[PDB]
């Protein structure tokens, strides 16, 4: 067809409030860097620094526990990077993320 929009909407209602701010933060940096053809994804060092800058997670082991319900729902996955850094990407359509910021205005 594309993917049902009810799946991405009913997944954030039953989600913790701290996890919604993390999903809405990675979508902003994805579209701003989408024009770059060499986009390999953000690293883990800069991702851990951005959490405390936007009052999110406090430690590292608690941040990894917040990514358990995202990898099981086919939202994000990790790749074996050669630089020892686990990349973070969202295997969805390019037009799906553009229609997500318009439904969160309320």
């Amino acid at each position: 067809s594309s993917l049902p929009l009810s799946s991405l909407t009913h997944v954030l209602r039953s989600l913790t409030p701290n996890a919604r701010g993390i999903f809405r933060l990675l979508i902003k940096y994805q579209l701003d860097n989408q024009d770059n053809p060499s986009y390999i994804g953000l690293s883990f060092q800069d991702f851990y620094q951005q959490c405390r800058e936007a009052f999110l997670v406090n430690s590292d082991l608690t941040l990894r526990a917040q990514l358990t319900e995202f990898r099981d729902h086919k939202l994000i996955r990790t790749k074996k990077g050669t630089d020892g850094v686990e990349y973070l990407l969202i295997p969805v359509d390019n037009g799906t993320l553009t229609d997500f910021l318009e439904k969160e205005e309320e």
């Binding site: 049902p4 989600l15 913790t16």
Partner: protein
């Protein structure tokens, strides 16, 4: 006073024992009971997929509604399902085939499914059978063919079966049920449950302790803190009842100290020390020779990890290059020599207390290992001034 009487009765109500509470769950329960009244009175039957929150303890909510219908209406029978002992995708239908019509049972004959189970359900002379479903996501297969027959029975001829599936949220209708977003015959219903914030965790504790205890053992300021971080992970009821019950036994153990030998209010500092070994690193308790952190032979190896990251711009190393850095710093400092024959056992030794980790490899030496998180934890709280202070300034 009633000191020993309050502690022996507080652990019974705070223990995770079928929390079948009615308050704090109003709009999430009335919709479930009212959905079944239209099917038993209106002679209707369909499907109902309940996508609960991952780990919140809602198994006791459905048990309250099932027992209330038995005392109201008398004539129907409800068959339970407990497929926890079924490791394979098959052997599920014959497990519930022995419950035909209560007093009327039969016996299996080998290879006889999809014939006699769906035949008695279409009989209009029998009562409205209610089937309960659990852990439906674990019953998948290579083509989920076993799930194509249980979702089409209340949609063909003679719809006399209501589907109730109790399972947490892992995946919606993407690969389990491909009939949705493709077929216009089935019309399922989806109900979710948001995580309970402070508006429900604090409320569920007011009717939990004030109704069975005589006097509280903690102040009201400690309730707003324990109910603050428990809803940030998932919001489980068992996690909220365990973080508070565990913080009482640590204070109760301190009561029998130079008191019984020949109530009080639990402070907030007594609670942070219990969750101190959950998310916080245990690197402070290391004085008076207390072996509660790091011994010795491992700090001289992990200190050389950051010495190679700033020189090669990589955060991954291996057992081969780890001994090369140790064989150089030992000859210039005159320390204990550790051969590489037992250094592999050290790799399977530094994993607790929240530190570095690794994976499993067939061959030795060549093992791709990495580090957890390194930023600012070797100073202030940790000494590292008279022990390995000369190592960081050397290279």
């Amino acid at each position: 006073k009633q000191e020993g009487t309050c502690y022996q009765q507080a652990k019974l109500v705070l223990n995770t024992a079928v929390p079948d509470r009615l308050p704090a769950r109003e709009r999430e329960m009335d919709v479930i009971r009212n959905f079944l009244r239209e099917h038993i009175c209106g002679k209707k039957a369909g499907s109902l997929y309940l996508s609960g929150a991952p780990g919140t303890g809602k198994t006791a909510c459905l048990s309250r509604i099932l027992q209330d219908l038995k005392k109201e209406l008398k004539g129907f029978k409800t068959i339970m399902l407990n497929c926890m002992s079924l490791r394979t995708a098959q052997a599920v239908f014959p497990a519930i085939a022995q419950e035909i019509c209560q007093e009327e049972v039969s016996r299996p004959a080998g290879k006889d499914m999809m014939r006699k189970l769906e035949k008695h359900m279409t009989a209009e002379k029998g009562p409205m059978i209610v089937l309960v479903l659990d852990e439906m996501d674990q019953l998948d297969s290579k083509g989920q063919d076993v799930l194509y027959t249980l979702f089409e029975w209340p949609w063909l001829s003679n719809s006399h079966l209501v589907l109730i599936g109790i399972a947490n949220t892992l995946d919606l209708t993407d690969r389990i049920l491909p009939r949705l977003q493709a077929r216009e015959k089935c019309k399922p219903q989806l109900l979710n449950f948001p995580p309970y914030t402070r508006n429900q965790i604090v409320t569920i504790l007011q009717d939990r302790l004030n109704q069975v205890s005589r006097d509280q053992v903690l102040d009201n300021a400690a309730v707003q803190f324990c109910a603050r971080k428990v809803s940030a992970v998932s919001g489980d009821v068992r996690k909220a009842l365990d973080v508070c019950r565990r913080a009482i036994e640590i204070v109760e153990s301190d009561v029998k100290s130079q008191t019984i030998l020949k109530p009080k209010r639990v402070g907030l500092i007594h609670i942070s020390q219990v969750i101190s070994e959950i998310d916080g690193n245990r690197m402070t308790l290391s004085q008076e020779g207390a072996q509660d952190s790091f011994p010795l032979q491992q700090k001289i190896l992990v200190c050389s990890l950051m010495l190679l990251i700033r020189q090669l711009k990589i955060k991954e190393v291996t057992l081969g290059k780890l001994y090369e850095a140790y064989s150089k710093v030992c000859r210039k400092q005159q320390v204990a020599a550790v051969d590489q024959s037992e250094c592999l056992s050290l790799s399977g030794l530094l994993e607790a207390r929240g530190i570095l980790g690794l994976k499993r490899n067939k061959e030795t030496r060549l093992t791709k290992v990495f580090f957890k998180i390194e930023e600012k934890e070797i100073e202030h709280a940790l000494k590292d001034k008279a022990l390995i202070g000369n190592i960081l300034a050397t290279g």
